[model samples]
Target chain A: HHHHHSYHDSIKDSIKAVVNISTEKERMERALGSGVIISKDGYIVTNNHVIDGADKIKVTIPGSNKEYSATLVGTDSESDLAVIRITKDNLPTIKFSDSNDISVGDLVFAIGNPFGVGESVTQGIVSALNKSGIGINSYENFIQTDASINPGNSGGALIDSRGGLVGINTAIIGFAIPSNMVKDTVTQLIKTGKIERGYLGVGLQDLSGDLDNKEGAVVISVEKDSPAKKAGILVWDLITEVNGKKVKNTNELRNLIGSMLPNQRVTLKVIRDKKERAFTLTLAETISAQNGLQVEDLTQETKRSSDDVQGVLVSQVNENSPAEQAGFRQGNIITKIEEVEVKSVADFNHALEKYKGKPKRFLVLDLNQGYRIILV
Target chain B: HHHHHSYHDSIKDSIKAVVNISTEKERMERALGSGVIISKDGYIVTNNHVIDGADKIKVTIPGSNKEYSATLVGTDSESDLAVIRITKDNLPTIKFSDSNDISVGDLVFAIGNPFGVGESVTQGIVSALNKSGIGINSYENFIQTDASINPGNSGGALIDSRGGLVGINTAIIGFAIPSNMVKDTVTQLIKTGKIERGYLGVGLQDLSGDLDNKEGAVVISVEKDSPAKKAGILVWDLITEVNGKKVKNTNELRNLIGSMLPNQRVTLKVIRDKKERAFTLTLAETISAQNGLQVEDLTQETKRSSDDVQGVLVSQVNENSPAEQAGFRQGNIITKIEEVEVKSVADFNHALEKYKGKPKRFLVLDLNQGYRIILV
Candidate 1:
């Protein structure tokens, strides 16, 4: 209605690149999603959830009744984005918009097949952006829109008013991951079947906000026989640097340490006994293990305890795990588990090592009452 | 690099409005921040974190080295913005720009002192917008910049490429909690030293995003013996309206309710077994160990904060009324009578039903329109 220029005509080629995808998983089940061509040689981009676990993938481009079979190129479940390649040539593509440029109330369009209503475009404004922690994906920064996307609209394109690709249309507000991240994942997935991350068996926490301890990360606990322990890292040690880069907090340290490859030597700067120390540790594969409980460190105020109980507070009681069966409930602060006095996550980990496969007794401080003992 | 008029020239007057703020809470305690005058009568905007907890707040103006004593206006810790005032007249001021209009790469400047280095200004382009959830404040929508924002720079002016003010700078990230919200809070704080929120003793939740519940807030649990229970409101009831406004979600409901004065009678529109019903209930104060629970009963600030166009002002607290007994005196506004939200006489009687066994609570707004809570 507020026409400035012929934007529709300018975006005709871009719209043609958006395709409807049909996928069949196992043998009998079928699903629908959408994709956009990213290269002249026919690389398609869509959401990972659309084609995940699919046995056969098909893409239907505009101006042709034929549905082309596509091959999975790459996928990143953390970001809910994926890339696929079609055996075609000379395909049109949409130009990527600087997503960081979009803001609230900006004009946007969602071109997708909603509720199997063929190809349709919905008009709306950007409701919100930088929406993270929605629990849809691990690395979420959703670009929220009210463009009426529905069941069959997953993996579709969310474009700006001028048809520039803003994000992939999925759910209510489809946030497109950073294009650089997509490109990196595409190349890596094309090189290998999946993505992997380096691992260091150590727990860490950001120093309390009220005070600045040079922004160093306070180590919670080091796993026994792990690279961190082998590197002489101790509990309560202040980690100041990773690979010579100053890590201002635990988050920065986590990313720097976790991004390394297996058997990679990583230099760390730490402070122990009021003196700075350095350690080189060889990283390994990220192998996840679950014991029973979950806990969080006490705040600075909480540290001023009357009883001097220095252990971390129990945050969660895992269902069917030893913690739940042992009558451990949320808000119970554990002072000692088994024979060891648990001061923090590091201490808890050390105590768990004594009985990695063996059940044990737990001593917990009730949130409002006195101490209680529970058995696993 | 090329322009008809330099940004420096455009911002010459705006930069003159930025001033140095010095505060001391104890002997030998001194700290610095900055502020921008919003009015000619010496109303200055600064960060609450900059002056919070300081026993004495003094501001120094540009060109004039005289330190002026300042009075606290209003502060919202959630957004970190605060307003303070100096009695000086004919002061320089800065104009506000629409933060929603600014974008990444837009040229901007942060004017303030850095590390107690007197006054200085730094120029850079906007790095990112809408960067939030950084845990700096409860409500976050940050406008990030490459411009230097130092410790003493807290509450300084972040102006547009020209002279228009974009936001208050801190951490090289500027967050502006909507101008209108600030205005409402300012007026209330000017008239009343502290703002108060009403309480509804019921647990509710917003419907899941995927579900289309027509934007109704569904009740999960209602506390026993609470005002909500006395009103016959049941669990699993879908609240469709509060005081006749269409209730969209829990957040909307919360803002609508929490903004009301205690002991106020409110009509709730709810869906019971798919049938629409109305439940009029007298909302009570958010009773807690720490509510300090001063109730307000104004339907409107200028008009409702007073009479029903009738009645004698608090000429005397009835000897048996609990007003005199509890220290409430003449000229005090009987906002809530006997736990009932009262705007006037008719309104007063409506709130009386909330009292069960104990003496009715008479909450009043005292002279200076500040505070009082008592038992009748």
Candidate 2:
């Protein structure tokens, strides 16, 4: 019990805030996961997928056999985070550290209920920071670690050696939501009970093979009537900074945009053909971002169309959401959006912009069956 | 040139010692690799596979275009390490650090020529230590890192924050030979110009299900007339300690034995039937250990044999070695050794012991055709 190691003491204290989460979707349908206690009054943060479609949710604190009933506060599928609350006071809580202070070699420990085992800890270092393109979350700015984060370790706390929470463990290869993002999302969730991520609506690409300008996000396409288009942001415009902060790549630019709220004004420094320019724009809210409909572009060219079926595949649809209300389901392909052939996400986004607040007709294609129209 | 970072200065100086290796197995068959200068007088260390069948070897130091011809000093496939020499002195050498001091979160840098590109340094941390069972080397004990050690990075230096060499970069997922093992192997190679790794000739398994004795290696079988048999190290003996150092598992015990020289004595503390006992054993020289013949048990059950030809598959055979002199080639299976059925590595080892230092008939099965008896 008195063993001394670099991360032992911190882990010992941090595990108290790491709770085991068990959820039941229905009879004979149960899932196991983990969560982090963020508040003394029992505000816990976990991955949204952990409690998705669950009829009942229970939280077990470390060293306690009695499970507490938790009510959902808010959940954001884009960031894969959910907030829950229990009727408890003066509980042990772990505070978030500045993930921006983290480096690749900095020590970290992942604490969770792996495989339903009570309170387990695994040690590793930060493998990478600001990892994106994983497609796990729509807004991905993950902190990758080499710690053995297995199933049931999701929603756990990834803490630094000093016992400060650096991130929340989420998914495969051990990606985590940075503490900065966690704090921001949690604040917005508790305040408005929903997430309204800022949307610039631009196709972006990372600068590669450009030895002169080694870093920057290249704007390839600006959406019609979007925030960037209104600000005169054009194709071939290089985004170098956001609100005076350096922008490393397209992923960073996407993350910065998602971190802000709609209607928030931001200053962008851009490079256009060796000339520097600045633009200030009021951010626009995303369309169908949180309607509980998730999609990805169909990769197989052969499966794109038989009945001219080409568009994004509905990867997931939340239960009892606007999508469900509109008769949308998972595995349905959105081939046409209001008479426009949706071939890609960019096309889908542009078409959806025409009906920002109004219900839009979506031509859904079921692979084994035929097509149907849904208004949402 | 003044990029301020924790590892920038160290990496800058360390790159000078990291040399790019180019080898030519024959005409139109060139290979690229990297190596670390271990001495000021031009003694370098690289992976054995890098120059395995090369007729010509050349090394290019960082910041220089001149390639120096290198001569092989010694190589050991068991550890995948080779020592080479160049006709030069006062070279920039990176000194080895005590790898035992390295922790999981400790900062590290991998300096090498990745994909034949100019010298590059990738920063990461020690992902794990004492990694084994990778099957890359016969005697496996590697340092696992996440520092992007790509192709041509093999044989380069894995250094600590201070630019001290902690390991020599090797195979996939960035495994490195620990500095301690590197130093020991390098010393033996330069001293005798050959390697003779000590052998125990015993089947070992990690202890499990015993809460009272959670740690130690369990001996399942001892080869007749081998060092363990001569020392009365019987089956079911739990090896807890070797030479006063604790043995956590079977891999550690195997590495301990391989690090020693043939005929070197080691005192092992063991537990038998819940009682402690001590035994001093003189290690034996391995048969076919350095004969440059490498084989592995064929994983597919169907590939074992059609003519009752159950034997290990010859994965590699070094040029100009004893195995090559005996007409042994890659893809050949040793079905029988001097009339003894060779079903597994243990059986092969025992069969070879009977004909030690004498010519024996090998039943070689070429899967493309039939079996042929070869006298070696």
Candidate 3:
């Protein structure tokens, strides 16, 4: 009853942009998802999980029985989003809405082709705008809606009431990446044919135990040889402002950094000793780009609190590495390496040890998990 | 600038309703949290974790030095809500805005008491809503905020832009119990004094991957002497419907039964062994409010003139009454219009006759709160 008939007509343009997509891998392996047409040039955006590892993708626009051939432009599995291009041109497409302006209770529409019964729109209110804790890929800030998206509607266009793209309808709670993040990444994928996401390699928490402020993310840990370490971004240094601008939350900092290319140095302002400190850090590629040794969370460390403070205990320290030569024994808590706190395995692996181009530094803590200014 | 200033001033009103909460257990162990004052009689809403397993709770209103003793009025563990009452009355309070109208990106404030260090406010936007799967108590439609909350501020307030109640501030992600749900739970707790809970004694998991017609909770384990087992409900049984309606998820089933009284008969239609079976089952207990409090009405029925400082303001001096020549100013806060210790208009009426036709010396605090011995 809440669905007005007039609402459907206004979004007809954007509905045309939400097209059905199906791909086949081995003649038997099949996949289906919805894609939002990004431009008149036939470029579309969808989840990486949709067209991932597929041999062929077939795009079916509304009013066309023919399925256009598509080639993968780029995919960021960490962000769980992808861009693909079709041979067709002059397609109806939608622009990205200013997702930053999205407030709670804004009306949203989901145009889906799950039934293959053309693109059907369902109405819902924006449930939550900035979703976090994707565990490993915490970089992407997702959106949540209760717009009746189900198994059939796995891939769909999340359209704002303005008939502009918000992102895609999804959930682990109707949770998926937003168009604001999607806008920059998709454009880079289309123009450069690759995603050049920069990396700082810092494990960040939303400034836990500090409830008086909402301006910064806590640098719980940092990588050893990464640019953050090279620039002296240490553990316990709260990144309050990035490039002189205060960030909204943890993901904002990640999104800004993730959108940049490697070798780009950015000024990061942080809080230390109740004072603001600044650092100029040259960013790098992800941990996968520069491989690191296998490690795990320091859950087994004796002291419960500080054990998880900054860095993980070295489970298998690489023998030829500077970490070992610094006399950093396996059980030693690595609060910081080169004056930087190494919060997670990846922050250290991706930011510090990801690339072996620079000489490494290791800061170690004793078996008692006590901190001392020892190594660099 | 004034318009901008007024909005933030309104936010302060909601913060006044948010109070510091502390509890002591055993010989030691003191914990700190925050609470929302909702009733003039000093009834408060806070998270169950704030007072759970604690012996005594003390609520301190922001500007008042008086600490109020709180007794657990009632609690709903499923929703993580609890109602407590202060021994005092006539406290200022705020209302719960329709949380259903709250949406993502709505600016919100989290008023907290970090370790009882008085009050501090953190600004954030509503991040998500209806966030669930918090260790099986699923019907929690949470209001998420980027508003910082520590273990210290866990039971704080999530106030909307209008500075009214959004819900309790929590995290297990600063996710809070929603407002409508909080109102229901808090009301029942204050009224009943006991929370009724239904127990099926069975473990459940969602039938994962492309949720379509799979609208039911899948039983993973069963408990002995439990209704589910006694009714021959086996492991791997799909609870498709309850009381003839299809169950959407395990949490839905919990919510449905959690609201029902003990021994209430419910017809459960479940899918077992690939066949749909109907069973007439007896319901369990949900171990399930107000004015309905022991708040005493303040009264001062002394010899009509013996005074402890308390009075009403002097809006009008009544020109012909005692002595207009005594020169009482318009803005004075009259402590005693005639030494009758007036606390209310009724108190003034009853005591005014005692000092009738005599010169009135108004013991007053000036508008700027300076002392004024005004004769009226």
- Using TM-score as the measure, which candidate wins? 2
User: Per-prediction TM-score, please?
Assistant: 0.42, 0.48, 0.45
* Model 1 lDDT on a 0 to 1 scale: 0.66
Model 2 agreement with the true structure over A1-376: per-residue lDDT tens digits: 1112124455667777888777531121244688999999899999887776453578888767677899889888777899999888889999789888899988787777643335556667899887454222434346888876765578999998888999999864588889888988898898788888898878888877764364789998988999999899999899989999888888778878887889999999998867789999999981123236766666443254343356777767878876788877877888899868888666787887887889788888876675898877
DockQ leader: 1
lDDT of 2 by residue, B50-110 (tens): 7664646788787666778998898887778899898887788887788777665456788
Candidates in order have lDDT scores of: 0.66, 0.76, 0.66
Residue B21 local lDDT, model 1: 81
User: Of the candidates numbered 1 and 2, which has the greater lDDT value?
Assistant: 2
Model 1 misplaced stretches (Cα beyond 4 Å): A1-7, A25-32, A53-69, A97-107, A114-117, A120-154, A169-174, A193-197, A208-214, A218-226, A234-237, A258-263, A271-275, A285-376, B1-376
State each model's TM-score restricted to chain B: 0.54, 0.62, 0.65
Assess each model's interface with DockQ, reporting 2 decimals per model: 0.03, 0.02, 0.01
lDDT: worst 10-residue window of model 2 chain B: B131-140
- Candidates in order: C-alpha RMSD to true structure: 18.9, 15.0, 21.8
Per residue, candidate 3 scores C-alpha lDDT tens digits across A245-353 of 7866678888778757788888988887577778887889811111123344544332353533566655555566654555655556666666456876556655464
- Candidate 1 local lDDT, B1-376, one digit each (tens): 3121124455668767888788531121255688888888788877766775453578888777577899887776544667888998888888877776777888776777432323455556788766332122224336777665666566888878677887787642444333334445556666665565566778888777523346778888887888889999888888888878787778777777876778888899988766789998888860001011122223233244353432113534444443355666656666656535564545554565456445776666665755667665
The candidate that wins on lDDT is 2
Interface RMSD (one decimal) of model 3? 11.8
